[model samples]
Target: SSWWSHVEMGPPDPILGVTEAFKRDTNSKKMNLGVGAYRDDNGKPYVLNCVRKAEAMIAAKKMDKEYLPIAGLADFTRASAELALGENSEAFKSGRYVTVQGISGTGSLRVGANFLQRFFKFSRDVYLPKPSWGNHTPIFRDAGLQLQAYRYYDPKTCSLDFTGAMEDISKIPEKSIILLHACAHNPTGVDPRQEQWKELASVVKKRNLLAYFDMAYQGFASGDINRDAWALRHFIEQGIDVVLSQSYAKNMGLYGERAGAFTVICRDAEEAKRVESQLKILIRPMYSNPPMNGARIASLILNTPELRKEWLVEVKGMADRIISMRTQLVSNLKKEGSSHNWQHITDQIGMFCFTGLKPEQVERLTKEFSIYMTKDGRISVAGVASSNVGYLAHAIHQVTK
Candidate 1:
């Protein structure tokens, strides 16, 4: 036998596998709702106009391919922090923030989780929202931390279970780490109101818990980056120290670029330096330094005023498209006479909708109707387009009824 004979065949990835299966199928009408990336109204991948402009500017500049710092580009990381914590954030002013480039949200989270496991004075248990992004659990677990879920989604109302979520977080041991979605929650798109955010922040402060924010869809959520950053900003305003993971995948349409930042908010410049040193230590052994190309593009677009304006407009365009798709999806479902109350379809925000379809129904839609999605019935609203909305709705109605 070969030396690798002991290795076993691994199961296909839950999310990426759906796309693979969809591609292999001969059906021309197959719809893939597995990945969370955005698609235009015509059911085609969208490249933001600003991104095209930035690419032109970059090509004109003829930047070099030199290695970036271990912590990545200073401009990109700083601009990312400013975007999340507001330009005038005390955390930014006090020089209490340490930001490092990561491989995207997953890598950012993994780095933060690993740091926590290495440095947190408290126990290794971290609290996460029930039914959060599917990848969160494994990311933290792989970082050598224990993971626990707190109630968040209320199936009865198909909305946020605020009371349960608060109670669960408050009951966690003091100084425990809590992961929060900064905006446009995944799996279920429902997000807490501003008042709920304030209340949750107060409770976390009172309980002396550490906040770990995952901001995967800042501009992509509300189309206004400032509004989407309310939760993280509010926590910082309340003087709560936080660790934040930032991703450009959804917002910048830079999924393949793997652009992201991991930030730790410390008490002062000295603490920030210490934290940054530790982060560099963690990064140097794993990949050494982040890629410079994507960071350079992001930095120029964000730091330049005109390009920033154009980028915001482009981001809003994507957000508007997703919102329109949601509306059309709900309209189409109701128009198709779906017995299922799909009010949640529009009530939810972001690129995904928890359609509440049963596993068997989802399977039927895939096997019979050539509609592809996860087994959990979550559909990427971005995948639905004007051309395919009717067919998708009819297929869903068929599976459900």
Candidate 2:
């Protein structure tokens, strides 16, 4: 018997597992809305021109495959920060932030969570939305932190449960870590309105909770980078410094390249220096160096004037297409005479929509209708292209009715 014989077999992933099942299906009408990857209107994956152009430039340079420092590329980090926080942001201008490149959104989150776990002098308990990204719970748990839930989604209205959230927020003790979605909250597309965000800021301040934000989709969510960044930036302006995990996988279409960063905003320059030194110390032993190819591509796109301008336009194009799908999906569902109000499909602004379907309904959508998604009823709006929008809408009507 092998030493590893007792290791139990693992089950498939809840999100990625749908892709596996999707592959095995032979139905031509089959639609896959699982996994948060971007798809074109023609029902195909997309790669932005700016990304291709950046890649071409990198190839032209033909740099050696040297290992990036444990801190990763500096220019990429700086631009990544400014791209979200803006050039004039007090946080950016003050040199009070520390950044490190990591392995996409999840890895960046793990790094920040691990760091918090190691150095945290506050409460060990961390709070997350009741229903959040499928991967969030495991990431924080694996990092050795006690995790709790806060009310986020209201099933009755199929919208943000703001009152429930405030109720939970009010009860939590001070200095507890709270995870937040910077924009385009996964699983449930419902995000807080501006007024609600202001209230949240006040409560967060009063309660003294630490914010750890996961910002995966920037420009791709709202067709404008600034608009998607409103919440995180607003929090900062109100003196709510945050720990951020930023991903370029969706907005830049660099899914395989794994380009992302983890940033911490400190109180002052000296605090930032000490935090960064500790970050570097943690980096040396684990992974040692982040990949260079993706970071270089992101850097060129963010650093160069012409490419940066072009990239912004391309990002908007992606956002526009997704929003177009949302409109089409809603229209078609209503055209099918669905008695159920499908308003949430359009109202929820993000890569995914929580369709309010129960687990049994989702199974029917997959088994009978050949449409695939997570059992939680989340449909990746990015996967619903114009070509398949009518088909998808009809399939939902079939199972839902």
Candidate 3:
């Protein structure tokens, strides 16, 4: 009799449900290694000093909350493109790329997917990494595109399956779309080496496939921003036009603020103008206009040299902390007299480590040790702190052994 009488109970989101369970567990030593956000060594959420300075500056200006253009804040969009393409980028200098502000990485990705669904007539298939972020499947599916996967993570090696990936890429139909994590492959944290990227660039170019780069963690992957962005820039330098989505959530610690951008590389400035017009049309009906506060904060931080410098240092600090946690986890695992080859824990970079723990072990960790994580055994290394490293290591060894 109700308007939604047929509505039934739905399952919790796999990633988010971990937090819910963790919160309900009243263990004093409980740890949440499920979520991807960065935490300080004190096991507390972190806010960047540069972000605070930018907000103070914005407040001092008394800026208006007026709605921005459908494409988003001009300064933010311009700075976003520069951040991704590098300051010396020829494509950026020639204005051969169109950039639009988005809600965040997820929003930007959805916008890019919708754009392809609406205009990309070449193929309806999108090939994603085998064990991509859980949201990826739904995002593309809801955008009206078919989902396919290229072999990526080799559970046996707990590393990149370069052979399988190359073979799969070679056979994909021409003009089809393929998605690549620009850096810091999520869930697995296994990115191809530079040589592999070059080979991939050549194959993608020879095959005439469209490359879509998702750069959700720019500075979060490696402490050096330029080094982390090598692959994406290399592809474009090789004359491969790519569509990209970027997020400030991790790098800038603007998670709730949701500042991000989407860029489309075109053959020329004229083509870029056309693509931009279409993007605005698509975005207008989607959200009308994006939020301004996050964009404004991000713009101020990225545009001001002083703030930008501080941001870089802060990003490096975060990355270093995560790297230290990885080292500690592996070191502690050795101290526990574990027999398994836990080298992958240290080899993986960024905020996540794809621990080779099975689902049953993960369950034991949660049930007996109060350590919460996804069933896939992917742990957020950022969640591990100096204080909890030993406890986490002990629990992992206990469950695994």
Candidate 4:
């Protein structure tokens, strides 16, 4: 009569599981470059100064623990959308966008996927990049949608496989769902140039495909929110009806608080209202309502004039530190007399550098130098520090040599 007897041990998560293994290792010098969490120069997790200030201000207000409505805080949701889509966006002016708060990036994606399944008449198949975030495939599949991959990531050049990706996407049926990394592509740091994005937008328009943009990094990618949003906003300008998933986890350092929003841009105000109602219907039974603490924090920082300025500078600081780490790591590897092409380590933007190290090399790093990262050679550049970069570079040199 045991209810849970049939449950089997599930496999460890690809990204987070690396963290678990890194934690259990007793080596004092062990370096964890597996997860995409931000770390300071001392190899410790960072909480933004602006976040702390917002938290203090909220605490001083002495707000009650009231449950937020099913759609979550309107101020937070509206501000989040405006942050992504420019305030002057025609979609916003015309009231053609529906925005709803969800758990975080992943949660917003799930809600969007569910809505797609419920509303769209196309085949229940979704297309994602070949080497997307580890969670993307399962998230869509769990929502009763079949998943397929389009070519991405040219291994030889360590860059985007633009031609292959475009060809694959072009072959999909009209109105099919396509997932795109808005900026700071996860695992692999490669992103298309503005020209490439324009071409991709043309293809989407020509093929009449539905675009689902995942904006997890935002301001954290280039340290400028507007620069990171270029692709998404460009697509919107191109007249593609777009669905967007956003997360404040990276930019605001609200990883545990799960602040995020999902948005759908329709053709008209009526469609927008209909979409919003459908989203609420889809979300109500799932979790009933999203928590208010994180949203409140994000809303305060975003809505207030002085706090918004401070938050932008703080985000830029995080980006600048990560950029310096990339440079130092690449420089140290070269100084150690390693002959491998280390330019990509610094050339890539955002929190990760696709090192192109083979599985054997990654394993060698762990066994010999206690350096931890995924077998795919994607290292969290944010995790690298001045103190550890030399050691890490030497480990790379040792493994590659």
Candidate 3 lDDT tens digits, 1-401: 98999999999889988888899998899999898988888999888999889999989998888889999999999999999999899999999999999989999999999999999999999999988999989999999999998999999888899999999999999999999999999988989999999999999999999999999989877798999999999999999999999999888889889899999999999999999999999999899999998999999999999999999999898999898998898899999988888999989888899897889899899889999988988999898889999999999888877
Candidate 2 CA-lDDT value = 0.88
Error of 2 at 367 (Å): 1.9
Per-residue CA lDDT of candidate 2, range 134-207, in tens? 79888988989998999998878888899899999999999999998988878778789999999999999888
- lDDT, candidate 1, residue 277? 92
Q: Where does candidate 2 stray beyond 4 Å? A: none
Instruction: Rank all candidate structures by their lDDT, best first, as comma-separated numbers.
Output: 3, 4, 2, 1
Give the TM-score comparing model 3 with the true structure, all chains together.
0.98
Tell me the deviation in Å of residue 158 in model 1.
Answer: 0.4
Q: Which regions in candidate 1 have their CA more than 4 angstroms from the true location? A: none
Model 1 C-alpha lDDT per residue in residues 1-401, reported as the tens digit of each score: 99999999999988889999999999999999999978887888877777788789989987788888899999999998888888888889888899999998888989899899899978798888989887888898988999887899998899999989988887888888888899888889999999999999999999998999999999766889899998899899898999999988878888888889999989899999999999899989989998776787788889999999999888888889888888887788889998778888888889889888889898899899888899988999888888998898888888877
Tell me the tens digit of each residue's lDDT in model 4 across 112-188.
98888888887798888979898898899898899988998888888899989889988888878888999888777
Record all residue pairs in model 4 with backbone atoms less than 3 Å apart, i.e. clashing. Answer: none
Q: Which 10-residue window in model 1 sums to the lowest lDDT?
A: 290-299
lDDT of 1: 0.88
TM-score of each: 0.98, 0.97, 0.98, 0.97
On lDDT, the stronger of 3 and 4 is 3
User: What value does the lDDT take at residue 15 in candidate 3?
Assistant: 93
Q: Which candidate tops lDDT?
A: 3
